[PDB]
């Protein structure tokens, strides 16, 4: 038994040295020659009213016009962001939703939470009403995140320390991803959907191969729970938002942290993170009621989105990069530009 | 300025807003209760009288109760406890025979109660404390002294003094006695006690809102 522990520690030291060997320079040094982004002053173009409780999740539709939001009042609202019209209002069987997803085709939405179930809703029903397509059961902990791969595949992270891939046709877990020692809080699909990255309460982030079911890489450095994770648009990097009040950028190929986004005045946790279309801007939501725009290449606080009276629980950039939506515990979503 | 279909879509949005407001009004007048306790604390009895979260709906004297049994969640409590920040009250359970049991069980219940009562999300949330299985305590106290659990205890090993000492031990964990109240109950009587506690909480909250309490 002790020999296995010794070999594990030896491998830990070996990989630590291997990462260190490749740390010949720092991203901040390499980017010292680029001009800083001007002050990023965005304004609330629209306010989406209608939720009567804390908003916990939101997701843009691929058309960059429709977005779904989940709130503790037990509703999914699909909004027309251009007009603020409510396209749909889906009453949830369990009001304890904590995540929501919009299918890339726009035909389905997903949501889940303390019920430990991912429910898929059909938006294009012949009868003209949204109905529960399928309820995915099998997770033993709360559903913290979910993301469609197709109309027939969805990947979900759970508080039971595992991520699962589902076949929505049969309602079965095609693959189960294990290795996190803490609750998996966030999930992000790569642009090609060949890989996805998850951050857990064990303060580490893991890269998964969707088809092989393997853990490709593990990333450490955060001092606390990773609440948010997002893939860089390139698909070779991702940013993590943690309770330790910092965002960190990890590179898959360099297999180590590149840059950390922190400030002395920032001492609260980070609830959500997202990139702009080019990836130059890293937008993060904070418990201190406002979102901070970060220069992803420079580490500088490039802007602030201060428009919410409570914790900014979720945010998302449109697929065309035209707007940012921030949900909040104050029960409002604001579109910024 | 709007087209015919745009005006129809705006009308649909207005109808959705109407339905949302009606649902909010209906939900705003419902008492939300969070039920907590140890793995064998007897909360099964509480639910009986009245794979994740279990919701129990019941109505008593015109009050509608949403009671949330979250004990099935083996995940990290820190990550979802804020979901219940708005509950009117918390029902906490602790089997009284736990004093001389091992996972010590009484001490685990005190640790959980300390971590819940003094939680930053429940500063002003009142707690209904149920001390269950008093009949078992009456029999077991005659054999196992309460001092086996609380060395500093020195009262006579009888139901009254021992149970009062346990209640004092749990109520002493309240570090914010000025802003928060604990309604203890040894145990249709329990549902009546919950009704009384929640109605007192609601009355006091209303008086605080109107500047009388």
């Amino acid at each position, epitope marked *: 038994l002790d020999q296995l522990r010794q070999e594990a520690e030896q491998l830990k030291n070996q990989i630590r040295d291997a990462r260190k060997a490749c740390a010949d320079a720092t991203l901040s040094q390499i980017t010292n020659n680029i001009d800083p982004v001007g002050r990023i002053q965005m304004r609330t173009r629209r306010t989406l009213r209608g939720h009567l409780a804390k908003i916990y999740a939101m997701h843009w539709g691929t058309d960059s*016009r*429709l977005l779904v939001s989940a709130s503790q009042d037990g509703k999914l609202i699909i909004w*027309d962001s251009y*007009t603020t*019209n409510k*396209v*749909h209002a889906i009453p949830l069987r369990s009001s304890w939703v904590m995540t929501c997803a919009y299918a890339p085709s*726009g035909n389905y939405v997903a949501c889940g939470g303390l019920d430990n179930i991912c429910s898929i809703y059909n938006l*294009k029903t*012949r*009868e*003209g*009403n949204v109905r529960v397509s399928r309820e995915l059961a099998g997770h033993t902990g709360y559903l913290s995140c979910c993301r469609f791969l197709d109309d027939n595949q969805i990947v979900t992270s759970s508080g039971d320390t595992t991520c699962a891939l589902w076949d929505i046709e049969t309602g079965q877990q095609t693959t189960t991803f294990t290795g996190h020692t803490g609750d998996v809080m966030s999930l992000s699909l790569a642009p090609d959907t060949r890989l996805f990255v998850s951050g857990a309460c064990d303060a580490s982030a893991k890269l998964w191969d969707v088809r092989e079911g393997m853990c490709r890489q593990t990333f450490t450095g955060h001092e606390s729970d990773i609440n948010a994770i997002c893939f860089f648009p390139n698909g070779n990097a991702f940013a993590t938002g943690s309770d330790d009040a910092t965002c960190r950028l990890f590179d898959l190929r360099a297999d180590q942290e590149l840059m950390t986004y922190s400030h002395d005045n920032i001492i609260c946790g980070i609830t959500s993170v997202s990139f702009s279309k080019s990836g130059r801007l890293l937008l993060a939501g904070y418990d201190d009621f406002n979102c901070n725009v970060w220069d992803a290449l420079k580490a500088d606080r490039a802007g602030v989105l201060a428009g919410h009276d409570n914790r900014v629980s979720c945010l998302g950039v449109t697929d065309d990069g035209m707007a940012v939506a921030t949900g909040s515990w104050d029960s409002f979503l604001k579109i910024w530009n | *300025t709007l*087209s*015919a*279909e*745009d*005006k*129809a*879509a705006v*009308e*649909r949005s*207005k*109808m959705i807003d109407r339905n949302l407001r009606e649902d909010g009004e209906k939900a705003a007048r419902e008492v939300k209760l969070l039920l907590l306790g140890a793995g064998e604390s007897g909360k099964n009895t509480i639910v009986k009288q009245m794979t994740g979260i279990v919701e129990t709906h019941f109505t008593f004297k015109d009050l509608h109760f949403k009671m949330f049994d979250v004990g099935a969640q083996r995940s990290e409590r820190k990550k979802w406890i804020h979901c219940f920040e708005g509950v009117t009250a918390i029902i906490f359970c602790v089997a009284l025979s736990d004093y001389d049991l091992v996972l010590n069980r009484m001490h685990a219940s005190m640790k959980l109660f300390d971590s819940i009562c003094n939680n930053k999300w429940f500063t002003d949330t009142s707690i209904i404390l149920f001390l269950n299985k008093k009949d078992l305590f009456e029999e077991k106290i005659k054999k196992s002294p309460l001092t086996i659990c609380y060395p500093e205890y020195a009262g006579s090993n009888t139901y009254e003094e021992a149970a009062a000492y346990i209640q004092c031990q749990f109520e002493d964990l309240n570090k914010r006695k000025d802003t928060k109240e604990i309604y203890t109950h040894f145990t249709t009587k329990n549902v009546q006690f919950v009704f009384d506690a929640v109605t007192d909480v609601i009355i006091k909250n209303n008086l605080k809102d109107c500047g009388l309490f």
Partner: single-chain antibody
Amino acid sequence: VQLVESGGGLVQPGGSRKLSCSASGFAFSSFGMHWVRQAPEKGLEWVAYISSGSGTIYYADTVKGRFTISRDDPKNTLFLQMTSLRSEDTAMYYCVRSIYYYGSSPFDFWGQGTTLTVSSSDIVMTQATSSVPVTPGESVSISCRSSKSLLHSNGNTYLYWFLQRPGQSPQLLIYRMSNLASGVPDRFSGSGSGTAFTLTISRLEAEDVGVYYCMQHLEYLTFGAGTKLEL
């Protein structure tokens, strides 16, 4: 999804009768309902509209003040109360469901229709090509024009295409001038610009035989005279 109209028959001129439509298999309450009539040997004509929730109601100027449209949502039924029946009111009346939200397809389902016999500013849509010989496997186009531009400032071109197969209710083919309706083959395609639109049936086959009607939905609804395609 089913709509069954009833209450037709023979009525004396100047009389009154009520049409009723029974809805089943869909959320009747969330749909706006239309009444569309077709004279025995002519095209479609919009009659009345009642919104979802009954907030908005419209009538054709030719019938305004005479007919009344009402719905019983708990009963899932639509009504048309007709008074002072004229000779021009002789027609088969269709009940059509319409749901309006971003990306929806209005006019997507039509009832089987009920025949009524009476004893005896608007946008103009033109289908000057009234008939076209057809052969299977060929590619055909059906042109249309409107007096006003149907392109709204919000980017939508409010033109609809309906195919009335011989002896059937009209079926939606394209809505908003480009979107293909569900259950329609990919052969059909809509296009248009400058207040002129065309419907292309490439490599046409059977079941594409009948009268094709264009309809505008920019403002209150007008149909074209209908282009007949025959083998």
